[PDB]
Amino acid sequence: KTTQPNSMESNEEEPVHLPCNHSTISGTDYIHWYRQLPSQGPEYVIHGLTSNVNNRMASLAIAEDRKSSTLILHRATLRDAAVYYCILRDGRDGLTFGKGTHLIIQPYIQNPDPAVYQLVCLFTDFDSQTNVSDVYITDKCVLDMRSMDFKSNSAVAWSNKACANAPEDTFFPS
Amino acid sequence: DSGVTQTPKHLITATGQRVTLRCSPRSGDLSVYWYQQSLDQGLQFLIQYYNGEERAKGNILERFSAQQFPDLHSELNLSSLELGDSALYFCASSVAVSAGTYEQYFGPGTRLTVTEDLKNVFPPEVAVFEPSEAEISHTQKATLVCLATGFYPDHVELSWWVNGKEVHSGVCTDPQPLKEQPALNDSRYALSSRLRVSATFWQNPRNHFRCQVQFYGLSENDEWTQDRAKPVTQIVSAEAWGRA
Numbered sequence A: 001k002t003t004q005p006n007s008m009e010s011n012e013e014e015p016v017h018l019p020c021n022h023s024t025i026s027g028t029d030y031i032h033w034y035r036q037l038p039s040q041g042p043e044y045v046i047h048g049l050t051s052n053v054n055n056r057m058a059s060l061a062i063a064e065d066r067k068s069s070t071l072i073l074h075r076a077t078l079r080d081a082a083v084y085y086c087i088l089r090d091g092r093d094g095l096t097f098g099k100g101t102h103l104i105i106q107p108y109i110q111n112p113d114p115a116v117y118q119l120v121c122l123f124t125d126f127d128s129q130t131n132v133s134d135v136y137i138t139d140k141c142v143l144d145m146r147s148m149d150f151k152s153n154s155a156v157a158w159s160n161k162a163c164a165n166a167p168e169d170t171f172f173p174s
Numbered sequence B: 001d002s003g004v005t006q007t008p009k010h011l012i013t014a015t016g017q018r019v020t021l022r023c024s025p026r027s028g029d030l031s032v033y034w035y036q037q038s039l040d041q042g043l044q045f046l047i048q049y050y051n052g053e054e055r056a057k058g059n060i061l062e063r064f065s066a067q068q069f070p071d072l073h074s075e076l077n078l079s080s081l082e083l084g085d086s087a088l089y090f091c092a093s094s095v096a097v098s099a100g101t102y103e104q105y106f107g108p109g110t111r112l113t114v115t116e117d118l119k120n121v122f123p124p125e126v127a128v129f130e131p132s133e134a135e136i137s138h139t140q141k142a143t144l145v146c147l148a149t150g151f152y153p154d155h156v157e158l159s160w161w162v163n164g165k166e167v168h169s170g171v172c173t174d175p176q177p178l179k180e181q182p183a184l185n186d187s188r189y190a191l192s193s194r195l196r197v198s199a200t201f202w203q204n205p206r207n208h209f210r211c212q213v214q215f216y217g218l219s220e221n222d223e224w225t226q227d228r229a230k231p232v233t234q235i236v237s238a239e240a241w242g243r244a
């Protein structure tokens, strides 16, 4: 089999190296990679054997001894946030998918501006160094903007019972 | 697209029903694979058929049948449906028997929801909430919210349509939809999505905003008896014009 770290979190516009071991005899066994996006089925990435291989998805470096291998996303974006499987595939079970690596990507938010507004209320413009029974609050979600080149952290809070506590010096206008 | 096609995208049934998931492979392939995936399972292998004959065995519980037909397209039956049988079902295809040299390709997948009573199925309430006047006075930007509320199950695809066109930029939605009564076995779900626009763009009345939600609900082949409207597969939508 193979093993890769459970989770990994890298940054936008960077190369991302996804390591995977296979000290078990990678004989005539091909190193395969498949990815799985937010709410979607698995799709193929790239697959190798004895040498390094390129395609429009990724680059695949394999070790001289082939005991380890490295999936490389040439330049990662919030899009490349997916689940990555490192599979061995050889000859005629064995068509199985491990836990893989929950890859996470974070935006380069230059100017945090924590402020919760009454829209339902909405918490937005905070840093990554922050995270979230009568009320409902949603997990934080980021939104990049073409042309403006600005990525925004936001999480929504709403209840039915009135803008209550849901953060540093956040803005609460009257 | 993935080459592989699969029917149907949505599927809902009461416990102990019998459903058959059809899969037309990649036109050029002779292997078809079936994988079941639940959150508390991940991507599990079920069975593989090469050129019409059975190849790799898996964990197709007795209840499951699988057939590749002469035309290389596969059916997969899942009899006497348990609540645990609720999972995402993936068909796959490959050139030769082993996927060593020539690799796999997955279709978009079937979402099977097995529920205790089809009365559990609910359309989503949908509401676009216009941005705060404060966000503008502070950030010189504007954030619209869309609340999609009270749906079962969570077959929901949200989309934003500004000025009639579909927008992918300035958009953000929760991957996981929020349960409403976390304690209830068959709770209804709620999804939130934001569309941020510039300040001026919101301040323009010529600009129209649409939060649109696809809901994969009940069949037109399912029996219905409630006084309330049938919770069928449908789009619910919220519009909003720009306020000066």
Ligand SMILES: OC[C@H]1O[C@@](CO)(O[C@H]2O[C@H](CO)[C@@H](O)[C@H](O)[C@H]2O)[C@@H](O)[C@@H]1O
Binding pocket: A021, A022, A023, A063, A065, A067, A068
């Ligand atoms: O017992 C020590 C332990 O360390 C290892 C762990 O992998 O170090 C190796 O790492 C690579 C595996 O991809 C080898 O190719 C490398 O040569 C070696 O240092 C193993 O050797 C060993 O199990």
